[PDB]
Design a protein around this ligand. Structure first.
Ligand SMILES: [Zn+2]
Ligand SMILES: [Zn+2]
Ligand SMILES: [Zn+2]
Lengths: 147, 119, 49, 56, 230, 56, 228, 65, 137
RNA sequence: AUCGAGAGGA
DNA sequence: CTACCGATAAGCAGACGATCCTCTCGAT
């Protein structure tokens, strides 16, 4: 640790989470592809609440929908926002992403490409699991604090 | 998930888009058949799983002399007759939870005190 | 009797302690082949050899 | 060992040897300790091979 | 080990025949999606067909081996949870004999099948030297088992200290495990038979650190004696 | 030691129940994973430690 | 009993966990490559996609398993009938070649005759099932050191290997003394002298010894003590 | 291989006691302990001399030539 | 009584029952008897028949010697050791020779014998016979 | 005598 | 706006593998 600012335990946790490498694969319960044609509406009743919002502070009928383990979303300091912007800035301008609030009943991220298009969304979800670095330095797998 | 087969060919049915009417159609590409879809769910992955936990829990499970027998009560056949085991889902990061079988009504219960359970 | 070594009673050896016979056997045959060349068992002497 | 039930994780089930050389090992204990001993003989034979080559 | 043997290798064909005469659809008539519970049946790695209700199939098979009518050295492994029943007449399989524990008396509640009565007739035969190993084997008092079958049985270690029930202790004695499983199928003839010919000479091996025991078995072979009388 | 044998015995015996409890704990899904290791890995670690200490 | 044909079959699941396009191909003896499994299944008898899976996945509700086999079906879409499946393997005369391999070399235990397929077809389904049941991480890899899966070869089986070789070399020699008798000289020494050599040396082979079975099988007893 | 003369460890003659011992065991049905005692073998080294002894000469004599 | 359970003592009675009936090298002997009694007949039938010469029932003598220039002696283990010979029985087979009609008993080498197997002389000798034969009982 | 093989010692 | 190259990844090949020692056995 910095010669500071060297025995400050909580200051040391910050550094760990800064380097311990985290993939999206390691937080997702399941991934699903649904046919949901109404960009403005959902066949899935669970969501719905989520759909009205994210129009405030063209697409495709093919919805990709992820579910994130709330349990392991604390074992690493992860907010839905970071998880989203992270996805967002990968594909930048050809994937439209929405997501659930951080403390909702379930944690979900919904994405649409922006035919033969049933197959392209499935290749994305490969990149999405096996290529998104949430935070940390690749290779640095597990990390332990010691005194 | 669940997916289906052709009524005539008996082959795999691949999904296709209605476009005009906004609905999902499976079709076979061996013959010509075409049906409307039953769910909107087309594909599903699961990384953290459940299926294959209770595994081959079958009638004669009582006769298996190598399963241990606990002293638990059973949630419904209020019997104290049961066999038990750890998640058959043999994988590095599975919990250590026990699953019980009421050798009286074959009701499957768990030793778990954190998780919800519908088997 | 140090470092995996031992002291043994000479008196009790004399009385036959841990005694063994040892046998060895030696084998031999006359010749291997020839219709007119056989080896001989004999107590040999000279003859030019 | 097949004298045990399934999913038994207790000490004795997996190699703990409650006894001492004076008290004497139980049948199970005897076997487990045997399994442990073999592992020792094995890499003594393997060490001397490895180190004999390192030295050279 | 002392008491182990090797399969010589019988002919499968009486069994295959017997099987398809006690249920068991052959394989080409089998339709999976309509009889999913069917325990599938293998002989020597050949899948001959399936069988619903295998707990009677298996109960007959075992009673036939213990009658003698199926060669005692054939091994039969019913796997309850894997829905499989596998029979091996393969030659060259190692196996060892052990006592057969059986539900007796009341639906407790296990006993050994050998009794004091049986032991007396064996010793009758020893002293007057009628009733032989084969006698024990033919009357289903004793059984052969190979590692594969070993997989599906619960073995006791000693008749007494592994099942008299429950109702003080000597401090010098080695500390016991438990009963703690009351669902036995077999009992060890004796634990000391796990040892081979050489380690059988070691006095108190259970008080020795194991690698030594190995050393002694290297040296027992090198010791002068009297290899033969003639 | 007569008395010493009793101690040694009641000393292992505590490490017996101490393992019981952790096991009993893990079976009821209230065992938490030590950062960076599996649920079952941490159990083995705990148990192996309670047993080395027991011996020593 | 009689003849030793160790032809090993591999069913191998391509593409890692994380990698997509998880095909299942298989290795056939004599066969220059590895064939998608759905071609094998046609090549046998089974043609319709849903029957092939029937022979593999024994449960209608096992969506995960089924899901895994979706890329296999696409893998064999280019082929849709017995005669063209058999054709991939390997004139026209190459169809014949394949029809034999499936019945002579492919899983020779079971049968080696003609009228079966259905049995070889179910067993392949069983292998596949077992493989997938393992990639799905629902049953473990196999213990390669489980004594119930090993066999000890003794005097009989050893001598029987040897005798076959010797007796066939004897038998081949009479077909040769049959020819030269253009218009009773049985070389007994072959069997006598051959069996001695393998019991004399360790070389379980007769004048080959390249066969490292020479590992001294058969060595000079040992009589230092009754116990030795 | 015949009863050795003289206990190894001490030197007391035991070579003349094999016959008597076999008789005290068979004829008077005695036990090896009181057999040995009666033959005047007190120190446990001489006791081992006879108690251990295996008489293989009998089996050697059984070969005809 | 006699229906009574067994104690750990009574188990040596049974180990004694074993061993009395199988001895110590049974797994050697059983391998060999299986080879001789059954398996050896099979190796004969296979590619066996020729193209017409066919084979049949195989016969195994009791071990003997071929005393060059002289008689066929019946050979015992002791003599074999001493004379550096091979304790081995001869093999005889039924060889049929079918000369069609149209369309349109025999020595076959010597098999070494495992001692104290069924085919060996020692296999059913009483202890006194063994001393006579100089083989150790 | 040599080539190989096997057993065994620290 | 297709080809040419120097370039980074993907893929079968191998030469080692403790010292010294002792004995015996088959084959040539
Ligand atoms: Zn169709
Ligand atoms: Zn119940
Ligand atoms: Zn004395």
């Amino acid at each position: 640790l910095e010669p500071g600012h060297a025995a400050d335990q909580e200051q040391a946790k910050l550094i760990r989470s800064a380097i311990e490498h985290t993939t999206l694969k390691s937080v997702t319960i399941a991934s699903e592809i649904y046919y949901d044609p109404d960009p403005r509406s959902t066949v899935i009743p669970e969501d719905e609440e989520i759909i009205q919002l994210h129009f405030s502070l063209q697409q495709s009928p093919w919805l990709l929908r992820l579910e994130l383990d709330r349990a392991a979303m604390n074992d690493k300091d992860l907010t839905m926002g970071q998880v989203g912007e992270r996805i967002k800035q990968t594909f930048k301008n050809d994937l439209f992403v929405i997501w659930s609030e951080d403390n909702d009943e379930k944690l979900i991220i919904r994405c649409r490409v922006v035919a033969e298009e049933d197959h392209m969304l499935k290749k994305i979800e490969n990149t999405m699991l096996e290529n998104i670095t949430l935070r940390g330095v690749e290779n640095i797998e597990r990390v332990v604090m010691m005194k | 998930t669940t997916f289906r087969f052709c009524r005539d060919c008996n082959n795999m049915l691949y999904p296709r888009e209605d476009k005009e009417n906004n609905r999902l159609l499976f079709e076979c590409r061996t013959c010509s058949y075409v049906e409307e879809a039953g769910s909107p769910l087309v594909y599903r992955h699961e990384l953290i799983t459940n299926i294959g936990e209770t595994a081959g829990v079958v009638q004669d499970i009582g006769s298996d002399p190598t399963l241990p027998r606990s002293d638990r009560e059973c949630p419904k056949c209020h019997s104290r007759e049961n066999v038990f085991f750890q998640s058959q889902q043999r994988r590095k990061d599975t919990s250590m939870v026990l699953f019980f079988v009421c050798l009286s009504c074959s009701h499957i219960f768990t030793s778990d005190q954190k998780n919800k359970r519908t088997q | 009797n140090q470092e995996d070594s031992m002291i043994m009673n000479q008196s009790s050896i004399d009385r036959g302690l841990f005694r063994s016979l040892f046998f060895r056997s030696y084998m031999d045959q006359e010749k291997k082949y020839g219709m007119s060349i056989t080896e001989t068992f004999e107590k040999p002497q000279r003859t030019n050899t | 060992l097949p004298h045990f039930s399934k999913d038994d994780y207790s000490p004795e089930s997996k190699g703990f040897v409650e006894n001492s050389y004076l008290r004497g090992l139980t049948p199970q204990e005897f076997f487990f300790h045997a399994m442990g001993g073999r592992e020792g003989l094995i890499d003594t034979a393997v060490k001397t091979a490895e180190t004999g080559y390192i030295q050279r | 080990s002392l008491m182990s043997c090797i399969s010589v290798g019988t002919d499968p064909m009486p069994i295959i025949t017997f099987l398809s005469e006690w249920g068991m659809e052959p394989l080409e008539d089998y339709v999976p999606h309509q009889s999913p519970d069917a325990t599938r049946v293998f002989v020597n790695g050949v899948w001959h067909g399936v069988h619903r209700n295998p707990a009677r199939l298996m109960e007959t098979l075992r009673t036939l081996r213990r009658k003698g009518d199926i060669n005692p050295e054939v091994s039969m492994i019913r796997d309850i949870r894997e829905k499989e029943l596998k029979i091996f007449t393969d030659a060259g399989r190692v196996y060892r004999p052990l006592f057969i524990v059986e539900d007796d008396e009341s639906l407790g509640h296990k006993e050994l099948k050998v009794r004091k009565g049986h032991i007396a007739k064996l010793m009758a035969t020893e002293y007057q030297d009628e009733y032989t190993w084969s006698s024990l084997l033919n009357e289903g008092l004793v059984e052969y088992i190979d590692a594969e079958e070993e997989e599906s049985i619960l073995i006791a270690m000693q008749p007494e200290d592994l099942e008299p029930a429950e109702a003080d202790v000597d401090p010098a004695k080695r500390i016991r495990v438990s009963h703690h499983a009351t669902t036995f199928t077999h009992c060890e003839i004796h634990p000391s038979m796990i040892l081979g010919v050489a380690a059988s000479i070691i006095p108190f091996p259970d008080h020795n650190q194991s690698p030594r025991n190995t050393y002694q078995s290297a040296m027992g072979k090198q010791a002068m004696g009297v290899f033969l009388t003639n | 030691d007569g008395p010493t044998m009793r101690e040694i015995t009641e000393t292992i015996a505590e490490a017996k129940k101490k393992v019981l409890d952790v096991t009993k704990e893990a079976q009821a899904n209230l065992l938490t994973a030590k950062h960076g290791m599996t649920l079952r890995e941490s159990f083995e670690d705990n148990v192996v430690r309670f047993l080395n200490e027991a011996r020593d | 009993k009689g003849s030793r044909f160790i032809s090993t079959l591999q069913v191998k699941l391509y593409g890692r966990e994380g990698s997509s396009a998880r095909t299942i191909k298989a290795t056939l003896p004599y066969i220059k490559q590895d064939i998608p499994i759905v071609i094998i299944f046609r090549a046998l008898g089974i043609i319709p996609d849903g029957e092939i899976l029937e022979h593999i996945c024994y449960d209608v509700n096992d969506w995960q398993m089924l899901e895994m086999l979706k890329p296999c079906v696409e893998d064999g879409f280019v082929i849709q009938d017995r005669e063209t499946a058999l054709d991939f393997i390997g004139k026209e005369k190459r169809i014949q070649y394949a029809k034999d391999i499936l019945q002579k070399e492919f899983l020779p235990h079971i049968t080696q005759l003609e009228g079966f397929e259905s049995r070889k077809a179910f067993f392949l389904g069983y292998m596949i099932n077992r493989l997938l049941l393992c990639a799905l991480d629902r049953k473990d890899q196999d213990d390669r050191d489980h004594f119930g899966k090993k066999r000890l070869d003794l005097a009989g089986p050893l001598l029987a290997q040897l005798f076959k070789t010797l007796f066939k070399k004897l038998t081949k020699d009479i077909f040769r003394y049959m020819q030269r008798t253009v218009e009773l000289a049985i070389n007994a020494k072959t069997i006598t002298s051959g069996l001695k050599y393998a019991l004399a040396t360790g070389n379980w082979g007769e004048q080959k010894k390249a066969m490292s079975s020479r590992a001294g099988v058969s060595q000079v007893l040992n009589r230092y003590t009754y116990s030795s | 291989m015949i009863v050795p003369v003289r206990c190894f460890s001490c030197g007391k003659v035991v070579g003349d006691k094999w016959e008597s011992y076999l008789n005290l065991l068979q004829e008077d049905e005695l036990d090896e302990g009181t057999a040995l005692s009666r033959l005047g073998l007190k120190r446990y080294c001489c006791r081992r001399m006879i108690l251990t002894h295996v008489d293989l000469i009998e089996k050697f004599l059984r070969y005809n030539p | 009584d006699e229906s009574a359970p067994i104690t750990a003592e009574d188990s040596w009675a049974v180990i004694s029952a074993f061993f009395r009936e199988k001895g110590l090298v049974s797994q050697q002997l059983d391998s060999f008897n299986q080879f001789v009694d059954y398996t050896l007949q099979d190796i004969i039938c296979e590619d066996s028949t020729l193209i017409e010469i066919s084979f049949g029932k195989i016969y195994v003598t009791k071990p003997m010697v071929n005393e060059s220039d002289g008689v066929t002696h019946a050979l015992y283990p002791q003599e074999a050791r001493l004379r550096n010979l091979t304790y081995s029985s001869g093999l005889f087979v039924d060889v049929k020779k079918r000369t069609y009609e149209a369309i349109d008993k025999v020595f076959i080498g010597r098999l070494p014998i495992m001692l104290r197997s069924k085919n060996c002389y020692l296999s059913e000798a009483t202890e006194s016979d063994l001393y006579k034969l100089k083989e150790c009982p």
